[PDB]
Design a protein around this nucleic acid. Structure first.
Ligand SMILES: [Mg+2]
Lengths: 49, 49, 97, 49, 98, 263, 49, 49, 99
DNA sequence: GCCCTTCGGCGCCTTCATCTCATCTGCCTATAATGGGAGCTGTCACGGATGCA
DNA sequence: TGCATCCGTGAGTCGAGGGTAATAAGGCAGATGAGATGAAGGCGCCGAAGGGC
């Protein structure tokens, strides 16, 4: 299973958090299996339904 | 007379053994040694030109 | 550390192929993530992975940091051959050169 | 015979400034103590303690 | 403490009246702990004996580094100073120059 | 049975069958997740050696996963009693072949464990360290094997632990690289090769070539006599004779003294 | 017995105890074969450490 | 990046250089010292070399 | 100068052996193997360096030859199943009086 | 005085099968056994996210 | 928007000085590569000597 490089997730600037517009407190909860994220949503399938 | 006699304080080597990971010669009197040419002396040698 | 990575990866492979409840699979994936974490940089997150003698293990990052790292210990300054060392004594009868 | 006009470098840790490494010419001496010229002590910050 | 843990583990796994203190006791951790202390510990060091005074001064010496103590990097400037209470208790002159 | 050598599944024999399949799946998962507490409770006594706590917990989880399949309710005992044996088996097996940097087969990690237990049980009863001959008497095996297993069980050490009383250097700084070239014996070997070439060129060319390909100097392989005959158009007895001539002339003290010095 | 006589003078490089280890095997150089062929020296199957 | 990574905060500058795909010129003093090239000062410049 | 071990004895001149005082005739290369065994008595023998020193370096044959030769040494002098010429699995053979 | 060319003689030297001896890998054991041991943290200064409010 | 709150960086130069520890684990079947065996073929080497030019 894929894993995240610590050099980029964890640091004084969280580079992964900067790119993805999140926070390290809102990334450790995910790449360490504490909370889910919504990978993608269906926009039209929700607009008509 | 202090226990810093020159007989136990003179050391020199031409070609002794070397370390495993890096091929630098080892250090100390038990091993054949080799004086450490640190970066501070690198500063002096660079300043000399 | 490489043995830990290999063990976790093999056990995760066994869990996936066998078919296990998602809690155990998630725990194994977390252990894999933390094992790669320890391999790349031990002690960066959480308590460092410790071996015998109760000392932090030397990961890849710790081999490139500080005075004892490769950069300022083996690259910048090296132990050299054709060298010696001894006590100094005044030589008042010597010439300047 | 072979030490005829062969320069040899002398250094003292710590090497603060450029003059902390000086190239002399060596003369064979009995004993086991390197004989330093008294004048170059100040440049070396060397002392005989 | 290790002894108490192991004996607490063992006293329940065996039926009553079939259990004896000898089988409740496994002296291995105690000797392991004393061997751990006496060797490979920096507070019990190789005797510095090259004259009677060195032997005398190696004992009756007060150290501050080790388990429960402060390392030299952890040591500030204030601790290294001489306290007015040092008088008569700890010599203010005898201390290594390093 | 119905997929291969079956038929188009009707309404009541497909959806209901898959539903009981999924129901059994979630029932197994439910009891498994309920009983992981037993695994984590049992793994507490197993830490402190070899592997970490959570690794042991995971291996016990795998053991329980295996155990739930073979658990038989018809025999009428609590599931914990049967599951404990399988969990212990999985943990012991994993600690045997996974907790060592130098992996050791279980068949003889068993005898290391038994040797340790018997020696430490007899030490307190006798009051002294048990001599390996007496341990062998308790083994019903030769003592030499006892010393062999004693020296096998020794685990490797770390190259990077600070070795001094004060922290200044690591162990790996004090280990000499044996594989490194001496840089003195290399020049000696080159000069020896030069001396050999001079000596051989001093000899007759046919003899020099014969011995050179006899000991495989110029090439990688020494050759048998018939190869020498095929490359020089002579019989193998003639090559034996010329070899006799070679080491006869090579015993000459002019070459003997000039080459024997090189040792 | 293989060790220095008591009351005997030694210096740097002198042998102290004669301990001989089975050398096992290695690449016997062809030049070694010609060397033993010139003097009749035995293979000396052990390593003198 | 090679000079900066050998001075301070090695992991941070290393990660930043990896992200930016920084191409070092291997032209400075410390870089040439590291890679074994002639230092670009004194007797290392093309006027004197 | 004759080299002896337990009940086997060798004369370096005329290349014969006594086994417990009984003279025995034996093959030349087989005799060289026995010479290696006595010259390194108490030290284990491995097939490779046995091949390296005793045999020519041009030997292109298989590995069964040395095992067969050891079998001949067994059937000539150490006829007993347990024998002074012990064998080590993967490490070869050794000449040693059993304990 | 020995080369050119012989039968065969067991040896011997391999080589093919072809058997055993450790050595190692996977599987099974049914009263019940159901939630971490332990960790000691705090130098000095200095730039920056940070959880809330 | 503060604003404490913390969180990761820096902190010397050569030399005395080497290595410290638990636990329920056990029969049993199969297999597998190493090493023990026996048998048969392709020369070796001679034991004979042929012989003459
Ligand atoms: Mg001074």
């Amino acid at each position: 299973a894929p894993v995240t490089h610590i050099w980029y997730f964890k640091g004084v600037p969280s580079r992964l958090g900067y790119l993805l517009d999140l926070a390290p407190k809102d990334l450790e909860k995910i790449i360490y299996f504490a909370a889910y994220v919504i990978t993608s949503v269906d926009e039209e399938m929700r607009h008509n339904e | 007379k202090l226990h810093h006699l020159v007989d136990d304080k003179i050391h020199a080597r031409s070609t002794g053994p070397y370390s495993m990971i890096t091929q630098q010669p080892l250090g100390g009197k038990a091993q054949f040694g080799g004086q450490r040419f640190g970066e501070m002396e690198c500063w002096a040698m660079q300043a000399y030109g | 550390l490489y043995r830990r990575v290999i063990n976790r990866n093999n056990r995760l492979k066994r869990l996936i192929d066998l078919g296990a409840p998602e809690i155990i699979v998630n725990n194994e994936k977390r252990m894999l993530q933390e094992s790669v974490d320890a391999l790349f940089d031990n002690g960066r997150r959480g308590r460092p992975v410790t071996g015998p003698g109760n000392r932090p293990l030397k990961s890849l990052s710790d081999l490139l940091k500080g005075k004892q790292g490769r950069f300022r210990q083996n690259l910048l300054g090296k132990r050299v051959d054709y060298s010696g060392r001894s006590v100094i004594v005044v030589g008042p009868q010597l010439k300047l050169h | 015979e072979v030490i005829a006009e062969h320069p040899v470098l002398l250094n003292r840790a710590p090497t603060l400034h450029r003059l902390g490494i000086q190239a002399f010419e060596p003369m064979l001496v009995e004993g086991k103590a390197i004989q330093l010229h008294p004048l170059v002590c100040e440049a070396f910050n060397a002392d005989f303690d | 403490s290790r002894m108490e843990r192991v004996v607490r583990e063992r006293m329940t796994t065996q039926d009553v009246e079939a259990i004896t203190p000898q089988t409740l006791i496994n002296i291995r951790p105690v000797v392991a702990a004393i061997k751990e202390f006496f060797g490979t510990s920096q507070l019990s060091q190789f005797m510095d004996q090259n004259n009677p005074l060195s032997g005398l001064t190696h004992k009756r010496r007060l150290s501050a580094l080790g388990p429960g103590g402060l390392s030299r990097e952890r040591a500030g400037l204030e601790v290294r100073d001489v306290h007015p209470s040092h008088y008569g208790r700890m010599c203010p002159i005898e201390t290594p120059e390093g | 049975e119905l997929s291969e050598r079956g038929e188009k599944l009707p309404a009541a024999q497909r959806r209901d069958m898959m539903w009981i399949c999924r129901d059994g799946d979630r029932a197994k998962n439910h009891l498994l997740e309920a009983n992981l507490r037993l695994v984590v409770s049992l793994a507490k006594r197993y830490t402190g050696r070899g592997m970490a706590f959570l690794d042991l917990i995971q291996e016990g989880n795998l053991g329980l996963i295996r155990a739930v399949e073979k658990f038989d309710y018809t025999k009428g005992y609590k599931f914990s009693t049967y599951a404990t044996w399988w969990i212990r088996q999985a943990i012991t097996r994993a600690m045997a072949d996974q907790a060592r940097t130098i992996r050791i087969p279980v068949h003889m990690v068993e005898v290391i464990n038994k040797l340790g237990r018997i020696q430490r049980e007899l030490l307190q009863d006798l009051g002294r360290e048990p001599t390996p001959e007496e341990l062998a008497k308790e083994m019903d095996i030769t003592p030499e094997k006892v010393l062999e297993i004693q020296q096998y069980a020794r685990e490797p050490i770390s190259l990077d632990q600070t070795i001094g009383d004060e922290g200044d250097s690591q162990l790996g700084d004090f280990i000499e690289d044996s594989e490194a070239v001496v840089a003195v014996d290399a020049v000696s070997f080159t000069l020896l090769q030069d001396q050999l070439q001079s000596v051989l060129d001093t000899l007759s060319e046919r003899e020099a070539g014969v011995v050179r390909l006899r000991f495989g100097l110029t090439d990688g392989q020494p050759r048998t006599l018939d190869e020498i005959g095929q490359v020089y158009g002579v019989t193998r007895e003639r090559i034996r004779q010329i070899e006799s001539k070679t080491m006869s002339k090579l015993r000459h003290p002019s070459r003997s003294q000039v080459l024997r010095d090189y040792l | 017995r293989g060790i220095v006589r008591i009351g005997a003078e030694v210096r740097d490089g002198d042998i102290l105890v004669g301990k001989v280890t089975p050398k096992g095997e290695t690449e016997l150089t062809p030049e070694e074969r010609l060397l033993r062929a010139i003097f009749g020296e035995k293979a000396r199957e052990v390593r003198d450490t | 990046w090679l000079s900066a990574a050998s001075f301070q905060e090695t992991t941070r500058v290393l990660t930043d250089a990896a992200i930016n795909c920084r191409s070092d010129k291997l032209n400075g003093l410390k870089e040439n010292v590291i890679i074994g090239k002639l230092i670009p000062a004194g007797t290392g410049i093309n006027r004197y070399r | 100068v004759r080299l002896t071990f337990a009940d086997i004895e060798l004369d370096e001149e005329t290349h014969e052996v006594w086994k417990a005082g009984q003279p025995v005739s034996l093959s030349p290369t087989e005799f060289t193997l026995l010479r290696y065994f006595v010259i390194n008595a108490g030290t284990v023998l491995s097939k490779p360096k046995i091949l390296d020193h005793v045999w020519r370096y041009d030997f292109g044959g298989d590995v069964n030859v040395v095992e067969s030769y050891v079998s001949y040494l067994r059937r000539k002098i150490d006829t007993g199943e347990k024998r002074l010429l012990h064998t080590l699995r993967g490490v070869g053979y050794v000449l040693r009086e059993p304990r």
